DNA sequence: ATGAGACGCTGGCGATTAGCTAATCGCCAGCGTCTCATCTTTATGCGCC
């Protein structure tokens, strides 16, 4: 097959959370978290723009992501 | 009741005196890197009005 579902898989191992991804409700959190990390690299501007977002995983998620 | 009108070696040299593009060819040309990202586009691989 030409299509894969990459990043489902790279989510699910890093968050080990499989429950986000598969949810149709956190797809416009999902589509602005692929956002803040393709827009940037700086590990600062990406932990600055997912401050919002430090809820919903572990600080050593955080840092994961 | 007299006193003007009629004007040269130059040309052919040397020998100063002065002055100017052009034709031929050769040489020799600032360059070195990295990072970072960014997009494309191509080779192959899959579908019928």
Request: proline fraction near 0%.
């Amino acid at each position: 097959f030409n299509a894969s579902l990459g990043t489902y898989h790279d989510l699910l191992k890093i968050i080990k959370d499989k429950d986000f991804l598969d949810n149709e409700e956190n797809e416009d959190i999902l589509e602005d978290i692929v956002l803040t990390l393709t827009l940037f690299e700086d590990r600062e501007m990406i932990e600055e723009r997912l401050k919002t977002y430090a809820h919903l995983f572990d600080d050593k998620v955080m840092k994961q992501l």
